[PDB]
Amino acid sequence: VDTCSLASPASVCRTKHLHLRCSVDFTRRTLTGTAALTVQSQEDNLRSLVLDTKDLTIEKVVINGQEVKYALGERQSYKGSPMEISLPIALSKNQEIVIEISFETSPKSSALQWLTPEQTSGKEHPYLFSQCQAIHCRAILPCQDTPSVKLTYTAEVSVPKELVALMSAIRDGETPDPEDPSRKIYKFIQKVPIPCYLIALVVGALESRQIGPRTLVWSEKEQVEKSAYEFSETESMLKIAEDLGGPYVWGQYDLLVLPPSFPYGGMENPCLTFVTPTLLAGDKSLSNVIAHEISHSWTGNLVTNKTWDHFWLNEGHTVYLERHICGRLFGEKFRHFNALGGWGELQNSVKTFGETHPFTKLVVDLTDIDPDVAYSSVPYEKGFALLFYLEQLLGGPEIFLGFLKAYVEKFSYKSITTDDWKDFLYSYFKDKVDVLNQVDWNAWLYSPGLPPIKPNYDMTLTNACIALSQRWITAKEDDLNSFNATDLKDLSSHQLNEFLAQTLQRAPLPLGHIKRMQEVYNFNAINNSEIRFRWLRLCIQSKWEDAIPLALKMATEQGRMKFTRPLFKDLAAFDKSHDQAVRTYQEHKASMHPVTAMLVGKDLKVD
Ligand SMILES: CC(C)C[C@H](NC(=O)[C@@H](O)[C@H](N)Cc1ccccc1)C(=O)O
Ligand SMILES: Oc1ccc2[nH]ccc2c1
Ligand SMILES: [Yb+3]
Ligand SMILES: [Yb+3]
Ligand SMILES: [Yb+3]
Ligand SMILES: [Zn+2]
Predict the structure, then answer these.
(1) Which CATH class is domain 12-204?
(2) For residue 524, how far is its CA from the centre of ligand 6 (angstroms)?
(3) Is 178 annotated as ligand-binding?
(4) How far from chain centre, in Å, is Cα 71?
(5) Hey, is 245 helix, strand or coil?
(6) Which of 27, 49, 406, 544 is the most exposed place for a label (fewest CB within 10 A)?
(7) 3-state secondary structure of 205
(8) Which cystines does this chain contain?
(9) Residues 532-551: b if buried by 16+ CB within 10 A, e if exposed
């Protein structure tokens, strides 16, 4: 049972297909049209069904050419309102019918951000983008909003003719709109069954550039050249991912670089991965995000978590594959460096929540919990740590990668639970069941806090980061003179970031130390978003008033939640910037992404 959904479950009925015909109205900030759901009964004598909705206006529901009765239940907070539909004729098991729902979204749809022209790069045209994961698809259209159900889809999207629509699907042509010659209709087809959280739409002044045999990059004109360079490794990553996972079944792998308010680093929308423009470091150093979203084309989009309680299945396996891709590209020592880094991030998350908090469990219970509030590095890094620990237990990376590929083949096009995964693990490693029985399954899967065992990590690339961080932490005033730009000589951007992560873990440092760090390393000059983020956090937590405007600027000029939330939170905790932090939020709130606005508000204890 999916406790995040109010819809009929898959054991009652199953959506097979969605045909979406809609029009994007920028003047009203609404999407209007029809969602035609092909639904298969899973029960004898089925006379009604229930769908998820959130802030949707329902005009009518049509079956067999006639309007039918429906009722909207009372709103249940972030879950929205259940929509019960009375079928005109009782259905037998496996019978399929088509239900056409006429609907309109609210301008406040939590799935959508509507951008004015001034919020874009080009400054002439408006822009719209969606983000459905986890449970926001219901805020665009009525559906069984649960990843336990998979469906194909086709869509026709009417937009002002100067603009371009793209979706998580294969592009299927464009025409003038016969009802309004100021508009164009873009058509789309997704022929691989997907969970509805993978439905995506963007509308804006988009151009494209080819960067590989199956990849275009899309953005506004002013970002195209930079993005084409930044993500030039994409095809080589796809080839490695195919070796690890089996065939790529989705046809195209395009990339869309969003405006700065995109709340995530990446989102694995099928055929069209969405990325933050904060990846545009100029040197490809943040390309692990591409490798990660590529990997979801197997772990997530083919084998899918059955409910959000089992989210770690999606993210843990994907981080595991991500790090393997990067390991092939740049070496096994680099894979170990990033694995160790991720353990550090797990340390941070556990410290933040508290070692007994329910959100530090690998498998969670999301009953009455908004997924956006529970979201953290835990499913990512506790999940990766489990897989990395099992890798080392069961005989190494090539043995465990054999399992991963067999796992993907086994559960392709299905939605599964932790027990399904574990059962298959035991089946596959039939001859190592005694080794498997040494794992403390109850602790790993269901207990809060750090995992019961830390895996073994090569320290080669990490040693210099730790060494330099320790020099700074143990330095006294009379030691500050010895630090010099040459300290950074042999460190990669990845190592500089890790040096800062190590140091941030022991923050605050004395203000004089941080002032010296800027004097000799000039971190204010670095544009790499990950580095700048940790440096600004270090400054604010160490009470450097000079860093206040810098932190405010970064918190607001982009909206990746990873950066925006902790920067606002740090700014709120520093007495000198507290009032500015709350004021800046209040002034920006209306033009923020709805999810980001909500979470920053909660973080700051405002509204
Ligand atoms: C390299 C990755 C760790 C990057 C990470 N992105 C992801 O994990 C994406 O695949 C996730 N699909 C992001 C997500 C998770 C849950 C709800 C909405 C969106 C991110 O930070 O955005
Ligand atoms: O967005 C999500 C989805 C599933 C989850 N499980 C735990 C946190 C979480 C967040
Ligand atoms: Yb076609
Ligand atoms: Yb001294
Ligand atoms: Yb208030
Ligand atoms: Zn992911």
Answers:
(1) mainly beta
(2) 30
(3) no
(4) 33
(5) helix
(6) 27
(7) coil
(8) none
(9) bbbbbbbbbbbbbeebbebb
Please give the Cα distance from 338 to 346 (Å, whole number): 12
CATH topology for 459-607 is: 1.25.40
Q: HEC states along 141-179?
A: CCECCCCCCEEEEEEEEEEECCCEEEECCEEEEEEECCC
Task: Report how far residue 150's alpha carbon sits from residue 301's, in angstroms, rounded to the nearest whole number.
Answer: 10
Q: Is the CB of 133 under 6 A from ligand 1?
A: yes
Query: Look-up: residue for tokens 């083949």?
Result: 409
Burial 319-335 (b: 16+ CB within 10 A, else e): bbbbbbbbbbbbeeebb
Distance 315 CA to ligand 1 centre (A): 8
Instruction: Please name which ligand lies nearest the alpha carbon of 565.
Output: 1
Rounded Cα–Cα distance for residues 458 and 478 (Å): 34
User: Is 293 one of the annotated active-site residues of the chain?
Assistant: yes
Which residues have any ligand 2 atom within 6 Å of their CB?
Answer: 134, 308, 311, 364, 371, 374-375, 379
Angstrom resolution of this structure: 1.8
Nearest Cα residue to 20 out of 33, 39, 7, 31:
33
Q: Token digits for 438?
A: 């040494």
Residue ranges covered by each domain of the chain: 12-204, 205-301, 302-458, 459-607
Q: How is domain 302-458 classified at the CATH fold level?
A: Neutral Protease; domain 2 (1.10.390)
Helices 547-557/561-573 angle, 10° precision? 140
205-301 CATH fold: Zincin-like (3.30.2010)
For residue 40, the one-letter residue type is Q
Q: How was this structure determined?
A: X-ray
- In angstroms, the CA 127 to CA 113 distance is 8
* Burial class of residue 522 in the structure, from the number of CB atoms within 10 Å of its CB (0-12 exposed, 13-18 middle, 19+ buried): exposed
- Residue ranges in 299-355 assigned as alpha helix (H): 311-330, 332-353
The yes-or-no answer on residue 179 being catalytic is: no
Q: Which two tokens stand for residue 277?
A: 């423009």
329 CB-near residues (< 8 Å, 6+ apart): 233, 236, 237, 240
